[PDB]
Amino acid sequence: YTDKYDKINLQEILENKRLLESYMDCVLGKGKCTPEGKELKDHLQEALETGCEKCTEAQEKGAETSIDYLIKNELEIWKELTAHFDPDGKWRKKYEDRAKAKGIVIPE
């Protein structure tokens, strides 16, 4: 039911920036989405980058998941989150930590 845009979608959307545009109302405020869905996604996609990875269990599991598809497919989107949180690119090393300690294929 809420497999996309609405709610229980994280990775099924994160999988393609076009699908991001689908739950993008949740994240940025654009199209259509559900309030409860927005809350879960906001905290979680936050945990993905410079937000709070070590927050809740939902956020930590979610961070892992979202860090995975974003860095491995949707790199420009990542840069937008970067520009939103730390546009200085300071915590690139925490990104480094997050990605390469979990086993996300990034080059070093």
mmCIF file with all atom_site columns, C-alpha atoms in Angstrom:
data_model
loop_
_atom_site.group_PDB
_atom_site.id
_atom_site.type_symbol
_atom_site.label_atom_id
_atom_site.label_alt_id
_atom_site.label_comp_id
_atom_site.label_asym_id
_atom_site.label_entity_id
_atom_site.label_seq_id
_atom_site.pdbx_PDB_ins_code
_atom_site.Cartn_x
_atom_site.Cartn_y
_atom_site.Cartn_z
_atom_site.occupancy
_atom_site.B_iso_or_equiv
_atom_site.pdbx_formal_charge
_atom_site.auth_seq_id
_atom_site.auth_comp_id
_atom_site.auth_asym_id
_atom_site.auth_atom_id
_atom_site.pdbx_PDB_model_num
ATOM 1   C CA . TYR A 1 1   ? 0.000  0.000  0.000   1.00 0.00 ? 1   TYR A CA 1
ATOM 2   C CA . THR A 1 2   ? 2.465  2.631  1.194   1.00 0.00 ? 2   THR A CA 1
ATOM 3   C CA . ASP A 1 3   ? 5.286  0.893  -0.779  1.00 0.00 ? 3   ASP A CA 1
ATOM 4   C CA . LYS A 1 4   ? 6.314  4.176  -2.397  1.00 0.00 ? 4   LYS A CA 1
ATOM 5   C CA . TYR A 1 5   ? 5.894  7.925  -1.496  1.00 0.00 ? 5   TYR A CA 1
ATOM 6   C CA . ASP A 1 6   ? 3.443  7.229  1.309   1.00 0.00 ? 6   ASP A CA 1
ATOM 7   C CA . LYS A 1 7   ? 5.398  5.566  4.028   1.00 0.00 ? 7   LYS A CA 1
ATOM 8   C CA . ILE A 1 8   ? 7.278  2.251  4.221   1.00 0.00 ? 8   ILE A CA 1
ATOM 9   C CA . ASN A 1 9   ? 9.569  3.155  1.475   1.00 0.00 ? 9   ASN A CA 1
ATOM 10  C CA . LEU A 1 10  ? 13.140 4.057  2.056   1.00 0.00 ? 10  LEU A CA 1
ATOM 11  C CA . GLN A 1 11  ? 15.240 1.952  -0.215  1.00 0.00 ? 11  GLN A CA 1
ATOM 12  C CA . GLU A 1 12  ? 12.495 1.384  -2.813  1.00 0.00 ? 12  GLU A CA 1
ATOM 13  C CA . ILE A 1 13  ? 12.585 4.938  -3.503  1.00 0.00 ? 13  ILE A CA 1
ATOM 14  C CA . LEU A 1 14  ? 16.286 5.608  -2.747  1.00 0.00 ? 14  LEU A CA 1
ATOM 15  C CA . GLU A 1 15  ? 16.926 3.095  -5.477  1.00 0.00 ? 15  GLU A CA 1
ATOM 16  C CA . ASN A 1 16  ? 16.373 5.806  -8.179  1.00 0.00 ? 16  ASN A CA 1
ATOM 17  C CA . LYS A 1 17  ? 16.399 9.655  -8.007  1.00 0.00 ? 17  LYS A CA 1
ATOM 18  C CA . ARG A 1 18  ? 13.266 9.550  -10.091 1.00 0.00 ? 18  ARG A CA 1
ATOM 19  C CA . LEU A 1 19  ? 11.684 7.507  -7.350  1.00 0.00 ? 19  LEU A CA 1
ATOM 20  C CA . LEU A 1 20  ? 13.190 10.052 -4.932  1.00 0.00 ? 20  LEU A CA 1
ATOM 21  C CA . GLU A 1 21  ? 11.127 12.583 -6.744  1.00 0.00 ? 21  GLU A CA 1
ATOM 22  C CA . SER A 1 22  ? 8.212  10.281 -5.837  1.00 0.00 ? 22  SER A CA 1
ATOM 23  C CA . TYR A 1 23  ? 8.704  10.539 -1.949  1.00 0.00 ? 23  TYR A CA 1
ATOM 24  C CA . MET A 1 24  ? 10.417 13.871 -2.352  1.00 0.00 ? 24  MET A CA 1
ATOM 25  C CA . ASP A 1 25  ? 7.511  15.586 -0.696  1.00 0.00 ? 25  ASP A CA 1
ATOM 26  C CA . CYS A 1 26  ? 8.456  13.665 2.395   1.00 0.00 ? 26  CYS A CA 1
ATOM 27  C CA . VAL A 1 27  ? 12.042 14.738 2.167   1.00 0.00 ? 27  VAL A CA 1
ATOM 28  C CA . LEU A 1 28  ? 12.039 18.128 0.474   1.00 0.00 ? 28  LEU A CA 1
ATOM 29  C CA . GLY A 1 29  ? 8.465  19.144 0.005   1.00 0.00 ? 29  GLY A CA 1
ATOM 30  C CA . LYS A 1 30  ? 7.417  18.696 -3.589  1.00 0.00 ? 30  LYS A CA 1
ATOM 31  C CA . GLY A 1 31  ? 4.759  16.167 -4.544  1.00 0.00 ? 31  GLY A CA 1
ATOM 32  C CA . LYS A 1 32  ? 2.824  13.725 -2.399  1.00 0.00 ? 32  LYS A CA 1
ATOM 33  C CA . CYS A 1 33  ? 3.608  11.908 0.853   1.00 0.00 ? 33  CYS A CA 1
ATOM 34  C CA . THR A 1 34  ? 2.129  10.994 4.118   1.00 0.00 ? 34  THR A CA 1
ATOM 35  C CA . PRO A 1 35  ? 2.954  12.948 7.441   1.00 0.00 ? 35  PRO A CA 1
ATOM 36  C CA . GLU A 1 36  ? 3.957  9.817  9.405   1.00 0.00 ? 36  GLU A CA 1
ATOM 37  C CA . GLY A 1 37  ? 5.994  8.755  6.431   1.00 0.00 ? 37  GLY A CA 1
ATOM 38  C CA . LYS A 1 38  ? 7.748  12.101 6.357   1.00 0.00 ? 38  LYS A CA 1
ATOM 39  C CA . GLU A 1 39  ? 8.797  11.744 9.981   1.00 0.00 ? 39  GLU A CA 1
ATOM 40  C CA . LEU A 1 40  ? 10.306 8.360  9.612   1.00 0.00 ? 40  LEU A CA 1
ATOM 41  C CA . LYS A 1 41  ? 12.087 9.333  6.405   1.00 0.00 ? 41  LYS A CA 1
ATOM 42  C CA . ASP A 1 42  ? 13.305 12.709 7.698   1.00 0.00 ? 42  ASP A CA 1
ATOM 43  C CA . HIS A 1 43  ? 15.046 11.213 10.743  1.00 0.00 ? 43  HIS A CA 1
ATOM 44  C CA . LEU A 1 44  ? 16.403 8.323  8.769   1.00 0.00 ? 44  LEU A CA 1
ATOM 45  C CA . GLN A 1 45  ? 17.649 10.069 5.616   1.00 0.00 ? 45  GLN A CA 1
ATOM 46  C CA . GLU A 1 46  ? 19.147 12.606 8.097   1.00 0.00 ? 46  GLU A CA 1
ATOM 47  C CA . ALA A 1 47  ? 21.061 9.744  9.742   1.00 0.00 ? 47  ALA A CA 1
ATOM 48  C CA . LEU A 1 48  ? 22.339 8.885  6.311   1.00 0.00 ? 48  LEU A CA 1
ATOM 49  C CA . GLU A 1 49  ? 24.670 11.854 6.081   1.00 0.00 ? 49  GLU A CA 1
ATOM 50  C CA . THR A 1 50  ? 25.632 14.532 8.591   1.00 0.00 ? 50  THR A CA 1
ATOM 51  C CA . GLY A 1 51  ? 22.634 14.098 10.770  1.00 0.00 ? 51  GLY A CA 1
ATOM 52  C CA . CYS A 1 52  ? 22.588 11.486 13.430  1.00 0.00 ? 52  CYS A CA 1
ATOM 53  C CA . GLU A 1 53  ? 23.677 7.958  12.523  1.00 0.00 ? 53  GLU A CA 1
ATOM 54  C CA . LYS A 1 54  ? 23.852 6.800  16.153  1.00 0.00 ? 54  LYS A CA 1
ATOM 55  C CA . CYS A 1 55  ? 20.383 8.059  17.039  1.00 0.00 ? 55  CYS A CA 1
ATOM 56  C CA . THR A 1 56  ? 17.545 5.556  17.281  1.00 0.00 ? 56  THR A CA 1
ATOM 57  C CA . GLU A 1 57  ? 17.418 1.938  16.179  1.00 0.00 ? 57  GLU A CA 1
ATOM 58  C CA . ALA A 1 58  ? 15.256 3.049  13.274  1.00 0.00 ? 58  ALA A CA 1
ATOM 59  C CA . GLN A 1 59  ? 17.746 5.737  12.371  1.00 0.00 ? 59  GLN A CA 1
ATOM 60  C CA . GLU A 1 60  ? 20.827 3.527  12.746  1.00 0.00 ? 60  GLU A CA 1
ATOM 61  C CA . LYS A 1 61  ? 19.385 0.584  10.619  1.00 0.00 ? 61  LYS A CA 1
ATOM 62  C CA . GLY A 1 62  ? 18.018 3.138  8.284   1.00 0.00 ? 62  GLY A CA 1
ATOM 63  C CA . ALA A 1 63  ? 21.204 5.056  7.949   1.00 0.00 ? 63  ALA A CA 1
ATOM 64  C CA . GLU A 1 64  ? 22.988 1.863  6.908   1.00 0.00 ? 64  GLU A CA 1
ATOM 65  C CA . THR A 1 65  ? 20.350 1.173  4.302   1.00 0.00 ? 65  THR A CA 1
ATOM 66  C CA . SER A 1 66  ? 20.135 4.657  2.922   1.00 0.00 ? 66  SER A CA 1
ATOM 67  C CA . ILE A 1 67  ? 23.920 5.179  2.926   1.00 0.00 ? 67  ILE A CA 1
ATOM 68  C CA . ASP A 1 68  ? 24.106 2.028  0.832   1.00 0.00 ? 68  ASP A CA 1
ATOM 69  C CA . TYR A 1 69  ? 21.847 2.884  -2.116  1.00 0.00 ? 69  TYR A CA 1
ATOM 70  C CA . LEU A 1 70  ? 22.636 6.601  -2.192  1.00 0.00 ? 70  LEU A CA 1
ATOM 71  C CA . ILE A 1 71  ? 26.407 6.309  -2.417  1.00 0.00 ? 71  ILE A CA 1
ATOM 72  C CA . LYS A 1 72  ? 26.206 3.313  -4.738  1.00 0.00 ? 72  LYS A CA 1
ATOM 73  C CA . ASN A 1 73  ? 23.771 4.840  -7.183  1.00 0.00 ? 73  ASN A CA 1
ATOM 74  C CA . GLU A 1 74  ? 22.569 8.334  -6.463  1.00 0.00 ? 74  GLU A CA 1
ATOM 75  C CA . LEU A 1 75  ? 25.696 10.351 -5.942  1.00 0.00 ? 75  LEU A CA 1
ATOM 76  C CA . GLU A 1 76  ? 24.342 13.773 -7.007  1.00 0.00 ? 76  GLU A CA 1
ATOM 77  C CA . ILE A 1 77  ? 21.549 13.414 -4.527  1.00 0.00 ? 77  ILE A CA 1
ATOM 78  C CA . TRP A 1 78  ? 24.149 12.774 -1.836  1.00 0.00 ? 78  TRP A CA 1
ATOM 79  C CA . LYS A 1 79  ? 25.792 16.039 -2.733  1.00 0.00 ? 79  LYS A CA 1
ATOM 80  C CA . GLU A 1 80  ? 22.462 17.817 -2.232  1.00 0.00 ? 80  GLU A CA 1
ATOM 81  C CA . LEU A 1 81  ? 22.227 16.426 1.324   1.00 0.00 ? 81  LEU A CA 1
ATOM 82  C CA . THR A 1 82  ? 25.825 17.436 1.825   1.00 0.00 ? 82  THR A CA 1
ATOM 83  C CA . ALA A 1 83  ? 24.970 20.966 0.653   1.00 0.00 ? 83  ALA A CA 1
ATOM 84  C CA . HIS A 1 84  ? 22.014 20.937 3.065   1.00 0.00 ? 84  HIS A CA 1
ATOM 85  C CA . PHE A 1 85  ? 23.887 19.825 6.199   1.00 0.00 ? 85  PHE A CA 1
ATOM 86  C CA . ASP A 1 86  ? 27.577 20.559 5.783   1.00 0.00 ? 86  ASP A CA 1
ATOM 87  C CA . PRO A 1 87  ? 28.161 22.267 2.445   1.00 0.00 ? 87  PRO A CA 1
ATOM 88  C CA . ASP A 1 88  ? 31.784 22.776 3.420   1.00 0.00 ? 88  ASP A CA 1
ATOM 89  C CA . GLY A 1 89  ? 32.411 19.107 2.899   1.00 0.00 ? 89  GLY A CA 1
ATOM 90  C CA . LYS A 1 90  ? 33.978 18.878 6.300   1.00 0.00 ? 90  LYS A CA 1
ATOM 91  C CA . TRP A 1 91  ? 32.501 15.636 7.520   1.00 0.00 ? 91  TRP A CA 1
ATOM 92  C CA . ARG A 1 92  ? 33.634 13.912 4.379   1.00 0.00 ? 92  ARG A CA 1
ATOM 93  C CA . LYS A 1 93  ? 35.746 11.836 6.698   1.00 0.00 ? 93  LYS A CA 1
ATOM 94  C CA . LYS A 1 94  ? 32.719 10.846 8.740   1.00 0.00 ? 94  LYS A CA 1
ATOM 95  C CA . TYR A 1 95  ? 31.148 9.943  5.401   1.00 0.00 ? 95  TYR A CA 1
ATOM 96  C CA . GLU A 1 96  ? 34.368 8.007  4.745   1.00 0.00 ? 96  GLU A CA 1
ATOM 97  C CA . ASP A 1 97  ? 33.913 6.317  8.165   1.00 0.00 ? 97  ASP A CA 1
ATOM 98  C CA . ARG A 1 98  ? 30.247 5.550  7.552   1.00 0.00 ? 98  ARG A CA 1
ATOM 99  C CA . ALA A 1 99  ? 30.707 4.192  4.092   1.00 0.00 ? 99  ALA A CA 1
ATOM 100 C CA . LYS A 1 100 ? 33.972 2.336  4.167   1.00 0.00 ? 100 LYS A CA 1
ATOM 101 C CA . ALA A 1 101 ? 33.545 0.853  7.677   1.00 0.00 ? 101 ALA A CA 1
ATOM 102 C CA . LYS A 1 102 ? 30.194 -0.655 6.712   1.00 0.00 ? 102 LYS A CA 1
ATOM 103 C CA . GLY A 1 103 ? 31.650 -1.968 3.524   1.00 0.00 ? 103 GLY A CA 1
ATOM 104 C CA . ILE A 1 104 ? 30.291 0.490  1.036   1.00 0.00 ? 104 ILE A CA 1
ATOM 105 C CA . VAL A 1 105 ? 32.416 0.450  -2.062  1.00 0.00 ? 105 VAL A CA 1
ATOM 106 C CA . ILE A 1 106 ? 34.032 3.861  -2.301  1.00 0.00 ? 106 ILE A CA 1
ATOM 107 C CA . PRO A 1 107 ? 37.580 4.484  -3.407  1.00 0.00 ? 107 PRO A CA 1
ATOM 108 C CA . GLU A 1 108 ? 40.436 5.385  -1.167  1.00 0.00 ? 108 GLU A CA 1
#
